[PDB]
């Protein structure tokens, strides 16, 4: 499993647009791309896809705000946030 590729796929499924994978330095916010009900649901994907669970307020539209950006998050936050229930 390539992480990177896999929240990418996520990314543009929740935006319905690949211009998430051919530009991914794009600014998600600033382009209109996603809103809050879409990043609600990217959390939730993020969770169902990978057991990673980031919160609300641990979202910030300044720091998540391109696909690689995005990326770089989750892949630091992947250990300490991963969960496994029991």
């Known amino acids: 499993m390539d992480f ?5 796929d996520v990314l543009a499924e929740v935006c319905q647009d690949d211009i998430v994978k051919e530009n991914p330095d794009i600014e998600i916010f600033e382009e209109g791309l ?3 009900f ?3 649901e990217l959390l939730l994907a993020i969770e169902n896809r990978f057991d990673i669970l980031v919160p609300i307020t641990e979202f910030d539209r300044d720091v998540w705000n391109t696909p690689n950006n995005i ?16």
């Open 38 to 40: 879409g990043t609600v």
């Open 4 to 8: 990177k590729q896999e929240v990418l």
């Open 71 to 86: 990326v770089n998050q989750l892949s630091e936050l992947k250990r300490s946030h991963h969960h496994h229930h029991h």
């Open 34 to 36: 996603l809103d809050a």
